[PDB]
Amino acid sequence: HMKYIINHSNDTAFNIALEEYAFKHLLDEDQIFLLWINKPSIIVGRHQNTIEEINRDYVRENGIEVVRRISGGGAVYHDLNNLNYTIISKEDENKAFDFKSFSTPVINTLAQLGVKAEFTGRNDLEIDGKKFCGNAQAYINGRIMHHGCLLFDVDLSVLANALKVSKDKFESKGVKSVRARVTNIINELPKKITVEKFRDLLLEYMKKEYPEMTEYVFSEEELAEINRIKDTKFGTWDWNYGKSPEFNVRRGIKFTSGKVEVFANVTESKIQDIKIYGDFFGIEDVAAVEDVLRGVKYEREDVLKALKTIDITRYFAGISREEIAEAVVG
């Protein structure tokens, strides 16, 4: 049960709904691959405090969509020259279909085109030391998604104009990360082609690599369900931005591997409710950490103790339990 999906819409909210539908709803297909393209868009991480990150007037003046995705991390700019990829797989020790496995097809497609690309660390591809691809992983029970962006000819100047600096205070508790080197594929190609051509060469490669893989074609009924998810999630303010929580405490700390913003309601010296925002990356939803902290004593020691009962690396990559405790409580 290995499939690809062809989706040529540029409707950001529709596209993201369709990807989620494949990830969460096409459970009889063990491996799913797709390539797709959004119109100009700021895509925000699953836990970002959207209202405090977006330049409202810029995105409005310029017609840019704002949609929250279902993986962690920070804000990303999409345009018609940003090629999105999606790799979905049933969790199975005896069969790996993931970013690593896609990376060879990308490298080889590019080598056909006269371009030497390299797989660096874990979650990016490079050309001459410059990153043109950035991967992120999401995990639900028994199912893994690796998804990301291939920079084909993106306008790299827009993001900085579309984002703002919050007036809310953050303690800056570390050093800042080094500025990465990025490039667009089109600039590295000896001969010019379009992003659509590149997309189709990649798919043609995938088909050659996996002769088993056939097209999954959505029925009218599935398309309806997909649009329902668009109408109730990715097309809504409640999802993309969302309601403020009940809180009598707010804290904010910027760590090297991410900003962490904590809104806690503390009653009778205990965590009555808590909600955590930020641009930290974790493979799984931070709700699980909120859940373990609820009813805990609002003291550093007790919060820390609770955090040592879970795998912190699933939720905050590169940030320690001690650091998260500090974000939660003084």
Side-chain angles (χ1 to χ4, degrees), residues 2-93 96-99 101-115 117 119-121 123-130 132-140 142-166 168 170-172 174 180 182-190 193-207 209-219 221-227 229-242 244-267 269-296 298-300 302-330:
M2 195 165 194
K3 302 295 164 71
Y4 66 95
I5 295 159
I6 295 181
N7 169 28
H8 287 150
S9 172
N10 301 316
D11 187 331
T12 303
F14 173 78
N15 287 349
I16 291 173
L18 185 150
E19 182 190 51
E20 190 183 50
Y21 194 80
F23 183 31
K24 299 180 176 174
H25 289 260
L26 297 185
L27 301 184
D28 290 337
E29 314 301 332
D30 293 331
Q31 282 84 34
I32 305 170
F33 176 65
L34 53 161
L35 303 165
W36 49 285
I37 302 177
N38 293 324
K39 75 204 287 294
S41 302
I42 305 293
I43 306 303
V44 305
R46 182 179 61 205
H47 301 311
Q48 285 191 276
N49 185 351
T50 315
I51 198 63
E52 293 304 323
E53 310 308 313
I54 298 297
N55 189 321
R56 186 188 83 203
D57 287 354
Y58 185 84
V59 309
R60 285 191 188 166
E61 286 163 8
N62 293 292
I64 297 172
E65 309 295 343
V66 176
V67 182
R68 183 191 295 286
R69 65 171 184 276
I70 70 177
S71 53
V76 186
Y77 184 67
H78 289 44
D79 75 11
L80 291 183
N81 287 299
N82 178 75
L83 182 57
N84 297 116
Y85 65 89
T86 302
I87 309 163
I88 294 149
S89 62
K90 179 179 185 166
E91 180 176 16
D92 177 358
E93 60 268 23
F97 181 71
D98 52 24
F99 185 56
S101 59
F102 174 62
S103 80
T104 280
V106 182
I107 294 324
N108 285 348
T109 302
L110 288 169
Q112 188 236 51
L113 298 174
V115 174
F119 178 74
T120 186
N123 289 278
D124 32 42
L125 299 167
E126 276 182 5
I127 297 161
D128 194 48
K130 300 163 299 206
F132 63 99
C133 185
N135 190 55
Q137 186 177 330
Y139 175 80
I140 71 192
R143 189 174 265 236
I144 300 165
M145 180 178 62
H146 290 266
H147 68 170
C149 298
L150 289 149
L151 309 178
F152 187 90
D153 194 12
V154 183
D155 187 352
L156 304 174
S157 77
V158 181
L159 186 65
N161 295 322
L163 293 188
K164 60 147 151 184
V165 179
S166 183
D168 311 320
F170 283 84
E171 173 184 352
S172 301
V182 316
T183 181
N184 275 299
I185 294 159
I186 203 173
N187 294 327
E188 305 297 349
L189 291 169
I193 61 173
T194 62
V195 64
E196 293 82 2
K197 180 62 189 191
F198 184 67
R199 175 196 68 198
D200 292 353
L201 280 164
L202 273 187
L203 182 64
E204 274 303 302
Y205 194 98
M206 283 291 288
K207 281 157 94 174
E209 195 81 298
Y210 305 98
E212 61 261 54
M213 178 181 70
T214 66
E215 200 185 350
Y216 194 87
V217 176
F218 284 123
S219 65
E221 291 186 10
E222 293 170 311
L223 280 167
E225 303 197 359
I226 291 166
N227 278 303
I229 295 175
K230 178 197 185 192
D231 291 347
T232 69
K233 190 166 178 174
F234 301 103
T236 64
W237 191 90
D238 289 339
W239 168 252
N240 293 320
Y241 289 83
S244 312
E246 298 301 310
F247 69 98
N248 56 2
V249 173
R250 179 217 168 255
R251 292 171 63 79
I253 296 171
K254 187 174 314 201
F255 304 100
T256 301
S257 292
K259 181 150 106 159
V260 179
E261 191 179 31
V262 179
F263 298 87
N265 204 40
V266 174
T267 64
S269 308
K270 290 200 284 306
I271 295 172
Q272 190 281 320
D273 216 339
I274 188 170
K275 196 170 187 83
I276 302 168
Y277 293 76
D279 57 14
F280 55 88
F281 175 79
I283 290 159
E284 303 196 62
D285 201 294
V286 83
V289 180
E290 294 164 357
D291 290 350
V292 72
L293 286 180
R294 222 174 262 113
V296 177
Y298 197 58
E299 296 288 351
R300 192 77 74 85
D302 300 77
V303 163
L304 185 55
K305 197 151 174 154
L307 291 173
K308 312 195 97 44
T309 68
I310 60 152
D311 190 356
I312 197 72
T313 68
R314 301 291 285 177
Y315 305 106
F316 310 92
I319 313 177
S320 75
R321 290 171 181 83
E322 289 78 8
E323 285 170 320
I324 295 302
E326 189 178 2
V328 173
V329 57

